[PDB]
Amino acid sequence: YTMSLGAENSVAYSNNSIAIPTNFTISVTTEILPVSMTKTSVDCTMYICGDSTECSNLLLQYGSFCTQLNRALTGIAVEQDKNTQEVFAQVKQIYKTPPIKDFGGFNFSQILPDPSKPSKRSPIEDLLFNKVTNGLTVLPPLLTDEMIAQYTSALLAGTITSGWTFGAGPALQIPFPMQMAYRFNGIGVTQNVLYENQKLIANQFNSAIGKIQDSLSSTP
Amino acid sequence: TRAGCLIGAEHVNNSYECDIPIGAGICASYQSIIAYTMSLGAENSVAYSNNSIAIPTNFTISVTTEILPVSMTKTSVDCTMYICG
Amino acid sequence: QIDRLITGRLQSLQTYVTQQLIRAAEIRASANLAATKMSECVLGQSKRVDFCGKGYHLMSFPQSAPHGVVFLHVTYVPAQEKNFTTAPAICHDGKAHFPREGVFVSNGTHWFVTQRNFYEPQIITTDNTFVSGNCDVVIGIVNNTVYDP
Amino acid sequence: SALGKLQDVVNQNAQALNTLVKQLSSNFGAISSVLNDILSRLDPPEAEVQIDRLITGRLQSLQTYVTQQLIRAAEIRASANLAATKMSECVLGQSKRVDFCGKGYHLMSFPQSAPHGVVFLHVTYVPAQEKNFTTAPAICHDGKAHFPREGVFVSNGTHWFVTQRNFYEPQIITTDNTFVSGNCDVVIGIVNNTVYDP
Amino acid sequence: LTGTGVLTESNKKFLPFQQFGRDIADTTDAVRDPQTLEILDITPCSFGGV
Ligand SMILES: *[C@@H]1O[C@H](CO)[C@@H](O[C@@H]2O[C@H](CO)[C@@H](O)[C@H](O)[C@H]2NC(C)=O)[C@H](O)[C@H]1NC(C)=O
Ligand SMILES: *[C@@H]1O[C@H](CO)[C@@H](O[C@@H]2O[C@H](CO)[C@@H](O)[C@H](O)[C@H]2NC(C)=O)[C@H](O)[C@H]1NC(C)=O
Ligand SMILES: *[C@@H]1O[C@H](CO)[C@@H](O[C@@H]2O[C@H](CO)[C@@H](O)[C@H](O)[C@H]2NC(C)=O)[C@H](O)[C@H]1NC(C)=O
Ligand SMILES: *[C@@H]1O[C@H](CO)[C@@H](O[C@@H]2O[C@H](CO)[C@@H](O)[C@H](O)[C@H]2NC(C)=O)[C@H](O)[C@H]1NC(C)=O
Ligand SMILES: *[C@@H]1O[C@H](CO)[C@@H](O[C@@H]2O[C@H](CO)[C@@H](O)[C@H](O)[C@H]2NC(C)=O)[C@H](O)[C@H]1NC(C)=O
Ligand SMILES: *[C@@H]1O[C@H](CO)[C@@H](O[C@@H]2O[C@H](CO)[C@@H](O)[C@H](O)[C@H]2NC(C)=O)[C@H](O)[C@H]1NC(C)=O
Ligand SMILES: *[C@@H]1O[C@H](CO)[C@@H](O[C@@H]2O[C@H](CO)[C@@H](O)[C@H](O)[C@H]2NC(C)=O)[C@H](O)[C@H]1NC(C)=O
Ligand SMILES: *[C@@H]1O[C@H](CO)[C@@H](O[C@@H]2O[C@H](CO)[C@@H](O)[C@H](O)[C@H]2NC(C)=O)[C@H](O)[C@H]1NC(C)=O
Ligand SMILES: *[C@@H]1O[C@H](CO)[C@@H](O[C@@H]2O[C@H](CO)[C@@H](O)[C@H](O)[C@H]2NC(C)=O)[C@H](O)[C@H]1NC(C)=O
Ligand SMILES: *[C@@H]1O[C@H](CO)[C@@H](O)[C@H](O)[C@H]1NC(C)=O
Ligand SMILES: *[C@@H]1O[C@H](CO)[C@@H](O)[C@H](O)[C@H]1NC(C)=O
């Protein structure tokens, strides 16, 4: 068939009519971004020739090709570690959440680390790790998965307990229903709207986080 | 180590910042050469409660440097002269 | 014969290293984008449209993934919109009144001022409006009273 | 090691040129790496074969060098596009983007020329000397809920004030700096305090 | 079939007509000794980067 771009929506434009929202939806969406690759190193002499000395003697006629290949692969390998360092190591303080998870009705259990798991990962992070499955060597990454999880845990604790203050300086504590009100003022909605409807917004946020986990678990 | 066998470095139980990267969380430094599991950061616990806020009473004007490359050396190679002279 | 094998294997290795370099450039671009999203969506609230999710961005949460990062973007989506009759200004006492922060709306008989992103009608007073000029210049100005506290 | 990013580019370009020059010393299976020696030693039927071996080796080396030069050119172009974005958004304006123009709340930026590069001096505002206060979402007065217009309610232990969020400047809670929305029965955590009327 | 490797005992049960063993990447990782019908794993020698 000929494809259809979208459903037609004739907006009811006139010179004296406006549409004002009377309600809101707290929507959580996923964005997946690759950060690093597998760090591969190739022994050029062993790949071309193995253990044959005559082959290596003939390979010496071609010069420093092997050195260039090894150096390019080494540059890629250090670039992967630099990429992980730039993405995850954006804080030099390891923040922790308080033992009491009283955030004014907001639930972060699906994104905070699970103490029951030995890997110290969140349920969402655990699901993400479960859903991803001759001279050649594979170098291990400089940051292990536990330390990357620790960095994400520190970022989550900072953004939950301190707002955006930890990204611009010292972590200044603020209650989470006040942080949310500040964010509401950032998008041009008054604080009263957040405070009056705090239970509904917390319920919507928890439902959206649960839908995110269900959608990741249910989509191949 | 998970990266491989390291000979000539004394493994210590202390955690420091990464000076020379070894891999799999192992880093090396000179102080003799020691090998250790690198620390991610100093540990800070934010004093969160449901009715307390922290307000700054002062400020620091901080100037930081950011170095960005813009161009390279413009190199031209005569292909005929390079291959054949 | 060994020379033929050497040149073939060397060409294969050069091809592999070249495509690895191209993929490394692509992954570096993606990682730079991920670091930008980490700085601007997680460590702050971004006014950039569609950079940190669909809708008005509230906050974001990072999650580690194998060779990657997953951002949970928490955004505000307006819903249950309602029609209202609107005007650019209110004419009162020969003066034009404009909303300080909101917008003038009418449900059919009465005029109110509300914030733009949520319906919260309030009485048009001098505290939430400002005066600029007379009523003869603004096209579409309507007549309504302006309360004085 | 402050200027390592520019020196890395200079070293990579110089090393690529040095490798390309060094590749002329390799014979690639021919009798000699010098063309004049082959042309002075052999008849054209076999000198053609030796020159052909040298040509294919040198051509492969030159193609390899051009390939990494194009990849590095793409990387430098991306870095230059980023530098142009920083010049437009940090120097020619004030950026609200977090960590794009330095660590902290960005105030302004200064460009400085560098060999094959640019150095941005980012002048930023860092909060310091923070102090604890007891806070509330709203103030209950006369059966009405009061919310700050631009600041935040703080308490030093006995008295309630309103201050701007990024600097401690306590002011008396009045009607000029608060707005009224609803009664006190809905907001969770509302506290009782007087609201002064000018 | 020649090569260099460490020949260890194998738990792979060959069918009686099969002599060599290959992995996904078409490299010989299992073999049968012709004198005594036993299965041997061929682990590559421990090459590494110094
Ligand atoms: C605002 O009013 C307009 C016009 O009265 C509504 O637009 C109509 O919507 C119905 C149902 O979708 C359509 O059958 C008509 O064709 C539309 N008219 C025009 C001119 O487009 C609009 O739905 C109203 N807005 C809301 C939120 O109810
Ligand atoms: C705004 O929307 C929310 C849901 O998005 C509404 O909450 C629902 O209200 C109905 C009827 O009161 C209940 O049956 C549902 O259980 C509620 N859902 C949730 C998640 O709480 C809310 O009523 C709407 N408010 C207005 C003024 O329209
Ligand atoms: C926060 O969310 C978690 C999970 O969404 C809640 O844990 C659930 O609690 C109910 C009742 O105790 C159980 O039936 C579920 O099996 C639990 N789910 C999981 C995944 O453990 C938790 O109760 C919520 N509230 C708090 C305060 O943590
Ligand atoms: C705000 O108050 C809290 C608790 O009253 C302070 O947190 C304590 O700080 C001391 C000094 O570093 C630590 O030894 C304690 O372990 C902290 N306790 C908790 C529960 O975190 C906090 O330092 C105060 N903030 C300021 C700016 O003084
Ligand atoms: C805010 O911080 C500045 C410096 O960061 C303080 O200025 C210092 O004050 C002390 C004592 O008055 C002097 O000895 C220093 O020489 C000052 N330094 C500078 C650079 O001027 C200032 O006093 C602080 N203000 C408050 C209210 O804490
Ligand atoms: C527009 O809104 C106003 C205020 O919300 C409505 O005025 C009130 O209407 C109710 C119901 O008839 C009366 O009991 C009140 O006394 C009215 N208040 C005032 C101050 O007059 C008005 O009816 C609405 N108009 C429409 C068409 O819905
Ligand atoms: C809004 O009010 C103004 C002034 O009260 C109206 O202007 C008057 O219009 C009548 C008839 O149209 C004239 O006789 C008067 O001389 C006008 N007065 C002035 C000061 O201009 C205007 O018509 C009103 N607009 C609407 C839509 O009712
Ligand atoms: C909180 O701040 C207020 C205002 O700065 C303080 O009230 C003043 O305290 C001083 C010293 O005790 C008195 O001389 C003034 O007369 C007070 N002013 C008023 C209007 O009462 C208050 O003491 C502070 N509380 C704490 C615990 O620091
Ligand atoms: C804040 O003030 C309100 C009203 O001044 C208090 O509410 C009263 O509480 C008493 C005893 O609990 C009741 O007998 C009254 O009927 C209430 N009046 C109203 C209008 O609700 C409230 O208790 C005060 N809160 C605090 C913490 O002091
Ligand atoms: C709006 O359009 C109507 C016709 O539908 C017209 O009568 C009226 O004058 C217009 N008002 C303005 C302010 O353009
Ligand atoms: C804060 O928590 C305490 C108990 O820990 C409770 O008494 C108080 O009502 C809570 N306040 C808010 C605003 O949730």
Decide whether any atom of ligand 4 lies within 6 Å of the B46 Cβ: no
Query: Which of C6, C65, C119 comes nearest A58 by C-beta?
Result: C6
Is there a contact between B67 and D2 (Cβ–Cβ < 8 Å)? yes
Chains that touch E (3 or more CB pairs under 8 A): A
C-alpha distances (whole Å) from A34 to each of A76, C27, C31 are: 15, 7, 7
The whole-angstrom distance between residue D50's C-alpha and the CA centroid of its chain comes to 53
C chain contacts of residue A23, beta-carbon cutoff 8 Å? 78-80
Where are the extended beta strands (E) located within B9-85? Answer: 10-11, 20-23, 26-30, 33-37, 42-45, 52-69
Comparing CB atoms, the residue among C17, C65, C86 nearest residue A69 is C17
Report how far Cα C124 is from the mean position of its chain's Cα atoms.
28
From CA D170, how far away is CA D153, in angstroms rounded? 9
Is C40 close to D71, i.e. CB distance below 8 A?
Answer: no
The Cα–Cα gap between D20 and C148 comes to 83
Task: Determine contact, residues C13/A69, Cβ cutoff 8 Å.
Answer: yes
Atom of ligand 4 nearest to the CA of D131: 27
Using alpha carbons, list the distances in angstroms from residue A53 to A58, C10, C78, C106, D32: 9, 17, 73, 91, 22
Sign of torsion over alpha carbons A115, A118, A121, A124: negative
Asked if residue C121 lies in contact with residue C114, where contact means CB atoms within 8 angstroms, the answer is yes
**C-alpha radius of gyration, chain C, whole number:** 29
Edge-first strand order for the sheet with B20-23 is: B10-11, B33-37, B26-30, B20-23
- C-beta atoms surrounding A197 within 10 Å: 16
Neighbours of A40 (CB within 10 A): 16
Ligand 10 atom with minimal separation from the A15 CA: 1
Residue of C38, C56, C105 lying closest to A87 (CB–CB): C38
D23 CB neighbours in chain A (<8 A) are 63-64
Q: What is the 3-state secondary structure (H, E, C) of D45-59?
A: HHHHHHHHHHHHHHH
The DSSP H or E segment spanning A39 is strand A39-42
The verdict on a CB contact (< 8 Å) between A20 and C74 is no
Q: What is the DSSP string of D121-157?
A: EEEEEEEEEEEEEEEES-EEETTEEEEESSSEEEESS
Contact in structure between D80 and B71 (CB atoms under 8 Å): yes
Burial annotation B15-36 (CB, 10 A radius, 16+ → b, else e): eeebeebbbbbbbbbeeeebbb
- Among C90, C134, C142, C143, residue to substitute to test ligand 7 (most atoms within 8 Å of Cβ): C143
Which atom of ligand 1 is nearest to C81's Cα? 27
Residues of A in contact with C13 (CB under 8 A): 42, 44, 47-48, 69
The answer to whether the CB of D183 falls within 8 A of the CB of D151 is: no
C-alpha torsion A133→A134→A138→A139, nearest 10: 170
Q: Do chains C and E touch (3 or more CB pairs under 8 A)?
A: no
Q: To test the ligand 8 pocket, which listed residue (D155, D156, D159) has its Cβ within 8 A of the most ligand atoms?
A: D159
Phi-psi region of A163 (alpha: psi -120 to 50; beta: other; left: phi over 0): left
- For residue B47, the CA-to-ligand 4 centroid distance in Å is 6
Burial A107-136 (b: 16+ CB within 10 A, else e): bbebbbbeeeeeebbbbbbbbbbeeeeebe
The DSSP call for residue A45 is: H
CA nearest ligand 4 atom 10, residue: B47
What are the beta bridge partners of residue A141? none
Indicate the DSSP class of residue A145.
H
Q: Provide the b/e sequence for D45-82 (b: ≥16 CB within 10 Å).
A: eebeebbebbeebbebbbebbeebbebbeebbeebbeb
What tokens were used for D109?
């930026």
Q: Which residues does chain D have within 8 Å of residue A63's beta carbon, measured at their own beta carbons?
A: 22-23, 25-26, 28, 57, 61
Our CA angle for A179, A183, A186, nearest 5°, is 140
Instruction: Determine contact: E48 vs chain A, CB below 8 A.
Output: yes
Q: Is B57 in the pocket of ligand 4 (CB under 6 A)?
A: no
Question: Which distant-in-sequence residues (6+ apart) come within 8 Å of D134 by Cβ?
Answer: B51, B52, B53, D154, D155, D156, D157
**Residue D189 CB less than 6 A away from ligand 11:** yes
Would you call C63 helix, strand, or coil by DSSP?
A: strand
Contact D97 C14 (CB under 8 A): no
| CA C130, chain centre distance (Å) | 27
CB pairs under 8 A between A and C: 266
Q: Is the CB of D126 under 6 A from ligand 11?
A: no
Chain A residues whose CB is inside 8 A of the B43 CB are: 93-94, 96
- Residue of C29, C43, C120 lying closest to D98 (CB–CB): C43
At a CB cut-off of 8 Å and minimum separation 6, what does C134 contact?
Answer: C94, C95, C96
Q: With contact defined as beta carbons under 8 Å apart, do A40 and C11 qualify?
A: no
Among all ligands shown, which has an atom nearest to the Cα of A106? Answer: 3
Interface touch C79/A23, C-beta < 8 Å: yes
- Are D74 and C25 in contact (CB < 8 Å)? yes
3-class secondary-structure state, position B78 = coil
User: Phi/psi at C98 (nearest 5 deg)?
Assistant: -120, 150
Q: How far apart are CA A204 and CA A197, in angstroms?
A: 11
- Which residue from A45, D73, A40 is spatially nearest to C20, judged by alpha carbons? A40
